[PDB]
């Protein structure tokens, strides 16, 4: 529901000489806040007892707004403090989750960096696939039912598993059922797709509405448990174990891509952006990520995406190989966001970046 | 035996205007020496013919003290040169090994950064486990004998192996016995623990006695041979080979952790420090490392630790994502050590950091 | 054929106040061009429609020379523009390929950084092995025929495979034959060598002819598809699949080596350089790479090498742990090349670095 | 005559990926060119034999366009090279002089940073006084004739002199007449104004059309010959000499103003800008200077001004106290100009800054 006018008229009552940058203390906040400080902003960090130490010891937040539980950040009391501090909120994974995507779309009355409407297209598998398909991006083949399996597939609902036949699908579904890991409701709505065999590149882009340009900021590969621990056990020992893979994100490793593939990398970003303009105006604003796998034919297949900042940007908080190229600076995604905010304020174009 | 008074009174006869930083040319010396230079110190590097090139070409040492063999660094001749150069020695893995931990505790009369007594708690498995257990840190389950195996275990004595049953334990012990890799004495004192299946995070902390604060400096994951080569062979081919895994440290890869896990990361550091104060006064001084595995339940299990600088700090000699956050600088662990030395000298608190 | 005199006399007609650095827009050009800009050069990038975006958005090239297809860069029309721009060309993988190594040796009349003759010793397996063998570097054992297989081997011709017996060799050769991946001509000239089981370190060196010194600039490990995707599938699932490994380079991951191994690392560089002086005068000039595997005995075995810049230097475009050590700068290989060019021009020694 | 459309349509045919910055090698070019390089531009310097050394040894120009004499820079041959190089010209004192202000207004068909029309308001004393008077800025009292002198005055036409009475005016005019320094035509059109007794502050501002903001970049005091040499002779010796003062600009000395006076400094800049918008649309663009004297009542009296970059910006080529404040950078006026050009190109607003 929340209008752009409701937001612009909230920001119009802001002290334009004291604009701060706020975010919830988690996910990617460390470089969101650091980047803001480095661009000259004073920063606000929503935190809580037990989870504030990293933000205190890294000295990255000027003002703390403590909540009883991160769920409270939707409360009207918290929205007010943020408005009185002249904060533009930078949204991220943990924030959307703890606040509630519905509360974010029509209950959170605080200016927010990015395209508020498009956060819904990252939450729903159908919208995401619609976007990527319509943008013209390679994705994994989808399988309507366990009976359609004709190759290796991954099945999504942590509770993940791999299958190479219909028979195997049920053997594993059942296994996870009796072990209490999975329930009938989950396996009823199982999502089955082609297992893509390749190298992981989570590609972090930035669309600048001020420059009308898609920029490449960096890349990481996921570090997931238990899978990355499992496959580090020799085959002979794996066969002697009764262990199922899980794919819980635990961290990130820096990576760069083969340079001849950057035209493809950029084209993918350009296409996603051009289509999202049509489907969800004004489209992508700021940080977005394509989570892909590079197959042996040097084709990037995207199995996921984000419409705001992805957690993997943490791998280059001190800048990376790509982010260096622009100005030879240790540029993080967090600082790139802050800069767009800085420039927008200076050019009187806050309306191109907030909603 | 070596007293703190024996050391303070050695340092009291130092030219306080010409304090240098010394270390043995190996392990982590490159950034120990670089960091020192960057903080304004002149540096001394103990080296030898055949092993001096890296320190010469990286231009990181101002004075070289050549020895016939690194074993000589315990010699009274070498301790004298170091004392005449006004050197505070920064200890590390290779230094403690080549010098001799016993020689270090009561025969090495040179001021040393860190808590000299606590180096013994990192050498002995019982002390280490006592510390970690008492600090309240998750560790792998220990197994008293091969007959207690009820899951997958790793067995330690390079000569390592994995077992999933009592039967397998002896099959493998025997295999390694007849191949000459392992002897009856080693397998008699075998250490058997739960094989933890997860992602490796070697977490490098710094406790500042001046600030009374535990800082997070960075993280690496180990790159070990042959294991990391072995598991890169496809399963079908592994099964056709007669090859045992080994876990010889060969290098390090940078990694960052999921941000929501930093409160846990920091809490672990805080607890280790608080307990080590009680058990080995004054406790941890400067660099320490928790070598952990993150399981699918997002719990960090520490299978090892160091009470001085860990080799994995080499992964961020040009700074890392975490070390950047403090001041936006390319800060290495070596430079963080040097700075504490700098600040201690300036505040007349050399007694808080040397022994 | 192309003489050093033919080249020096081409450069002698250059405007020495307007020397630019040129390269083809691919492979490693991003930091070749960035490094040049950072050293004060104006830069020329050969590019084409569809592949120019990365070089435009990273703002790394001052002048673009567009070609219809990268194959045209051999054309006399293109050599002229480069000569009129006073360009010294920095050669790399994609450039030598698209231009043609034969065209490079005697048809490309443009000054070029490096030793032009030695590019042939990197293209031919016999010359390379001669060099490495004569330099005294550990290499994988070679196998004359499938009948000599007495261990695990890798077989080279993407079309690669692993074998542990003569029987397996033919089973797999045949498999790849009927699947259309491999033809009789390829398997007739198959190269069979010892499969080395260890950790990958692609070591990037720089030989400075001005300083007569081999420098260590950085290291990466390869990120290859599908192999690195394949071995991330649990063993039980791999066995259920009919999938062959491929080793297509897709990207790079940063790594550092155990510090005690740097004397070996440096010695290897020193030896390769000393022998290449004898075998191909003046020897190595500028960037060269040893692609190695570290076995459990801590011995580096080199399975490949380059005589110019290797693609893995892309992992440290913002500098790395080793490159930092010299001057505490974010130094890339591209900038190190540019600097040697800068210094050579300033000292009137362009003849030590071009040909 | 030259239209904005004539210029925009010249720039519209420019290769927008290869925009360079050009200027004549004199006046303030060193930091104009340096600043451009620092912002990523390739630079063009118009120079000539005998006057090119500073630009060559400071390594500040990528391309040289040599002319026979600086007067040639109006020639259509030179305008073409500049257009083929995609140069935006940055105008300055020596350029306007050597080219010819009339040639600049309607014969110089090359895009130019700044407001082309307003260069005429800096050349004509009546326009300048109109502007400053209408802006509401304190100026020295004007005197219509030698008979109106009722205080100390300075008389302008190098050929300058000071008078405290009508009688003295003629005594000195005559003196300079018989010495050949001055001719009847000059003294016929003599400009007589109040001698202001105070401290010199040449204040360098920058109006950003993109930000709609007047910025303070720095300040210098003039170093003039022979006057600054004359007044360094003790009074007793001056009285024994037959020497007239001259005020030939020879150099600049850095100075900062009393901080409580910055509101006045800024207000003066704001007023000049607001009025110049009305009188010469779009008004001031980029660099402008108020040359003032601070009297004992702490009032700044402006005796001169420039509508483009003033020579005194040379005093802070490595940045100054004021220019540092924005981002803690060594920011020169030349780099501030280049940045506005950079930002304009990126935001597609080249029309706000060129003409
Ligand atoms: N089509 C696929 N083929 C092969 N592996 C896949 C595929 N899809 C997902 N995976 C693996 O499962 C992991 C989790 O994928 P998922 O689709 O859950 O991403 P996500 O929802 O963005 O979760 P996260 O936020 O933790 O990245 C991926 O990182 C990848 O390793
Ligand atoms: N409990 C465990 N579960 C799973 N893997 C383990 C466990 N303990 C050790 N490993 C593996 O064995 C390797 C060597 O562990 P070890 O306990 O020998 O560490 P260390 O003595 O500190 O040796 P290094 O100094 O080389 O790190 C670890 O890096 C890890 O990969
Ligand atoms: N002797 C070997 N033992 C084990 N693995 C090997 C061996 N030789 C090659 N490999 C694996 O195959 C990959 C490709 O090796 P190859 O010899 O084709 O290198 P290359 O020709 O330099 O190709 P690229 O330019 O892509 O690195 C290596 O990166 C390595 O992972
Ligand atoms: N009204 C005044 N009162 C006192 N001194 C003055 C006055 N006007 C000028 N001067 C002195 O004469 C010098 C030259 O002033 P002038 O008006 O010629 O400046 P200009 O034309 O901008 O020359 P330049 O470009 O060399 O600064 C000034 O720097 C100042 O020292
Ligand atoms: N890549 C990362 O480091 C990362 N960190 C977090 N995330 C995603 O963000 C979500 C919220 O993070 P958290 O559960 O740590 O609060 C997680 O469910 C996960 O999908 C990531 N992908
Ligand atoms: N992680 C590392 O790079 C590392 N480098 C050395 N070490 C430890 O330090 C000890 C001494 O090192 P060295 O053997 O290279 O002299 C080794 O036995 C090993 O346990 C490490 N963990
Ligand atoms: N390591 C790399 O990133 C890399 N990038 C390219 N290359 C080599 O350079 C050759 C040419 O590269 P390209 O095919 O991207 O033009 C490739 O065949 C490959 O052997 C590499 N090794
Ligand atoms: N302040 C200076 O350094 C300065 N340098 C030059 N100028 C002005 O620029 C005019 C042109 O300079 P030049 O004569 O050096 O070519 C000079 O007549 C003088 O009025 C200055 N004010
Ligand atoms: Cl992102
Ligand atoms: Cl995320
Ligand atoms: Cl450590
Ligand atoms: Cl260690
Ligand atoms: Cl290289
Ligand atoms: Cl290569
Ligand atoms: Cl100015
Ligand atoms: Cl001037």
Q: DSSP characters for A136-160?
A: T---PPEESSGGG--S-EEEE----
Which of B165, B255, B266 has its CB closest to that of A251? B255
CA distance B48 to C17: 46
B96 lines ligand 2 (CB under 6 A): no
Chains D, B in contact: 3+ Cβ pairs under 8 A? no
Query: Looking at CA atoms only, how far is residue C87 from chain B in angstroms?
Result: 31
* A231: Cβ contacts below 8 Å, ≥ 6 apart: B231, C231, C232, C233, C234, C235
Helices (H), A64-150: 76-84, 93-99, 101-106, 125-135
CA distance A34 to B325: 7
User: Is B267 flagged in the annotation as binding?
Assistant: no
User: Is D40 flagged in the annotation as binding?
Assistant: no
Structure determination method: X-ray
Find chains touching chain D: ≥3 CB pairs under 8 Å.
A, C
Residue B329 main-chain phi, psi, to 5 deg: -115, 155
Which segments of chain C belong to CATH 3.40.50.20?
1-111
Give residue C113's region: left, alpha or beta (phi > 0; psi -120 to 50): beta
Query: Does the distance separating the beta carbons of B255 and A226 come in below 8 Å?
Result: no
Do D140 and D301 meet the contact criterion of CB atoms below 8 Å apart?
yes
Ligand 8 nearest-atom number relative to CA D202: 1
Q: DSSP characters for A210-246?
A: TTTEEEEEEEEEEEEEEHHHHTTS-HHHHHTS-----
* A277: Cβ contacts below 8 Å, ≥ 6 apart: A283
Measured between beta carbons, which residues in chain C are less than 8 angstroms from residue B324?
none
User: A194: CA distance to ligand 1 center in Å?
Assistant: 12
Q: DSSP characters for B227-277?
A: HHHHTTS-HHHHHTS-----EEEEEEEE-EE-GGGHHHHHHHHHHHHHHHH
- Positive or negative torsion for Cα B313, B317, B318, B323: positive
User: A330: CA distance to ligand 9 center in Å?
Assistant: 16
Q: Which residues line ligand 5 (CB under 6 A)?
A: A 26-27, 93-94, 97, 249, 252, 311-312, 314; B 258, 260
Measured between beta carbons, which residues in chain B are less than 8 angstroms from residue A29?
259
* D347: Cβ contacts below 8 Å, ≥ 6 apart: A210, A211, A347, D210
CA distance D70 to B85: 63
| Closest-CA residue to A139 (of A285, A337, A338, A295) | A295
Mutate to test the pocket of ligand 2, among B304, B306, B307 (most ligand atoms within 8 A of CB): B304
D72 lines ligand 4 (CB under 6 A): no
Q: How many CA atoms lie within 13 A of D240 on its CB side?
A: 5
Residue C61 main-chain phi, psi, to 5 deg: -120, 135
Query: Does the distance separating the beta carbons of B53 and C266 come in below 8 Å?
Result: yes
User: C6: CA distance to ligand 14 center in Å?
Assistant: 28
> Which fold, D140-197?
Dna Ligase; domain 1 (3.30.1490)
C91 lines ligand 7 (CB under 6 A): no
Where is A279: in which H helix or E strand? helix A262-279
Ligand 1 nearest-atom number relative to CA A249: 26
- How many residues does the structure list for chain D? 355
ω into A72 cis (within 30 of 0): no
Q: Which residues line ligand 1 (CB under 6 A)?
A: A 140, 154, 156, 193-196, 222, 224, 247, 249, 291, 293, 303-304
Instruction: Please tell me what DSSP assigns to residue C297.
Output: T
Ligand 4 nearest-atom number relative to CA D196: 3
Q: How many CA atoms lie within 13 A of C24 on its CB side?
A: 25
Which of D18, D40, D64 has its CB closest to that of C63? D18
Query: Does the distance separating the beta carbons of C26 and A296 come in below 8 Å?
Result: no
> Which fold, C1-111?
Rossmann fold (3.40.50)
User: C93: CA distance to ligand 7 center in Å?
Assistant: 6
Residue C221 main-chain phi, psi, to 5 deg: -115, 145
Nearest ligand to the CA atom of B290: 11
Tokens 């020897």 correspond to what residue? C283
Q: Residue D157's beta-bridge partner residues? A: none
| Closest-CA residue to A136 (of A264, A8, A10) | A264
For the record, the structure tokens of D158 come out as: 């190098």
Query: Looking at CA atoms only, how far is residue B197 from chain C in angstroms?
Result: 13
> Which fold, A112-139+198-355?
D-amino Acid Aminotransferase; Chain A, domain 1 (3.30.470)
Nearest residue of chain C to residue D53 (CA atoms): C17
Which segments of chain B belong to CATH 3.30.470.20?
112-139+198-355
Query: Looking at CA atoms only, how far is residue C234 from chain B in angstroms?
Result: 8
């Amino acid at each position: 529901m929340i209008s752009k006018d409701e937001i612009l008229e909230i920001f119009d009552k802001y002290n334009k000489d004291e604009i701060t940058i706020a975010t919830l203390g988690s996910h990617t906040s460390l470089h969101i806040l650091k980047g803001a400080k480095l661009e000259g902003f004073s920063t606000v960090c929503i935190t809580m007892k037990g989870r504030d130490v990293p933000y205190k010891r890294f000295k990255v937040a000027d003002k703390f707004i403590y909540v009883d539980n991160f769920s409270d950040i939707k409360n009207e009391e918290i929205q007010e403090k943020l408005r009185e501090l002249n904060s533009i909120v930078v949204p991220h994974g943990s924030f959307i989750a703890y606040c509630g995507l519905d509360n974010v779309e029509n209950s959170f009355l605080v200016p927010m960096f990015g395209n508020r409407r498009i956060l819904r297209w990252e939450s729903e598998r159908s919208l995401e696939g619609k976007l990527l398909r319509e943008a013209g991006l390679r994705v994994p083949k989808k399988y309507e039912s366990p009976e359609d399996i004709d190759g290796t597939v991954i099945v999504k609902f942590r509770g993940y598993f791999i299958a190479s036949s219909t028979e195997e699908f049920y053997k594993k579904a059942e296994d996870l059922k009796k072990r209490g890991i999975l329930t009938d409701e989950d396996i009823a709505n199982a999502h089955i797709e082609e297992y893509v065999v390749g190298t992981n590149f989570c590609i972090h882009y930035f669309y600048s509405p001020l420059k009308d340009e898609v920029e490449l900021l960096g890349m990481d590969k996921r570090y997931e448990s238990n899978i990355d621990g499992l496959v580090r056990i020799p085959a002979k020992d794996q066969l002697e174990m009764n262990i199922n893979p899980s794919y819980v994100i635990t961290g990130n490793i820096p990576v760069v891509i083969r340079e001849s593939l950057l035209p493809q990398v950029f084209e993918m970003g350009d296409k996603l952006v051009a289509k999202a303009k049509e489907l969800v105006p004004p489209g992508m604003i700021g940080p977005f990520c394509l989570q892909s796998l590079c197959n042996e034919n040097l084709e990037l297949v995207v199995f996921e995406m984000s419409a705001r900042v992805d957690g993997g940007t943490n791998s280059f908080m001190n800048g990376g190989p790509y982010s260096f190229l622009y100005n030879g600076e240790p540029l993080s995604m967090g600082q790139r966001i802050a800069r767009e905010i800085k420039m927008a304020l200076q050019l009187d174009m806050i309306d191109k970046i907030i909603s």
